[PDB]
Amino acid sequence: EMPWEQALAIPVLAHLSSTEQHKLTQMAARFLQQKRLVALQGLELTPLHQARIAMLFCLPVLELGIEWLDGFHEVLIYPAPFQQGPVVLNWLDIQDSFDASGFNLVVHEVAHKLDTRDRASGVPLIPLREVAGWEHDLHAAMNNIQDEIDLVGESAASIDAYAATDPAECFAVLSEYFFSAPELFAPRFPALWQRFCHFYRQDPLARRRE
Ligand SMILES: [Cl-]
């Protein structure tokens, strides 16, 4: 028996409703039926680690569906940092991804898969008529991040200068914020935040209230 109840007890998942926890648990169990977590270079992942990884994968698609993760069959997990291709992660960053700090490698990688589900362009599958307005708000968010970096420096800035430059990277980083530290996102980028709420069919800030 996978320790699903104990798996849920991590900060990034702490604000899910009881129905959301049940729904996430089931999707994660389905994930582990359909996909392999391949721990490399002697890394050993316990059932609790595996359950938590599966849940992190499923969080961004909780309301979209597990089929949104059909662009990969396996996840490769190295102990540490260095198309239909496997998602590559490392255990050091995954452990950080359990916190509600704004960093989440799993969500980052999922965002990239949602983006390219198509070229990696910072635009996931949205209506054709919304693409211009999405790109407008994304690129404004990017310029806003560059202005910050120009003013206070890379270290003091929230986001790395790569997210200010590559729209795909921006999408992926803001997705990390969306799920892990929405207070860094909602008040700063209200228009883009609204589009992400509509795309992901989740409101992580409303969640904290309830
Ligand atoms: Cl949170």
Alpha carbon of 177 to ligand 1 centroid (Å): 9
Long-range own/partner contacts, residues 168-173 (CB < 8 A, 24 or more apart): 168/112, 168/115, 168/120, 168/121, 168/122, 169/122, 170/122, 170/138, 170/141, 170/142, 170/145, 171/111, 171/115, 171/122, 171/123, 171/124, 171/138, 172/108, 172/109, 172/111, 172/112, 172/115, 173/108
Please give the annotated binding residues for Zn(2+), written as ranges: 108, 112, 169
Q: What token pair was written down for 117? A: 């589900």
Alpha carbon of 176 to ligand 1 centroid (Å): 10
139: β partners: none
| Residue 194: partners with Cβ closer than 8 Å, 6 or more residues away | none
Q: What token pair was written down for 94? A: 């995954």
Reported structure resolution in angstroms:
2.2
C-beta atoms surrounding 82 within 10 Å: 5
Alpha carbon of 200 to ligand 1 centroid (Å): 15
Q: What residue ranges define each of the domains in the chain, with the CATH number in brackets?
A: 1-99 (1.10.472.150), 100-210 (3.40.390.10)
Residue whose pair of structure tokens reads 């997705």 in the numeric block: 175
Q: Please, which experimental method was used?
A: X-ray
Eight-state DSSP code of residue 35: S
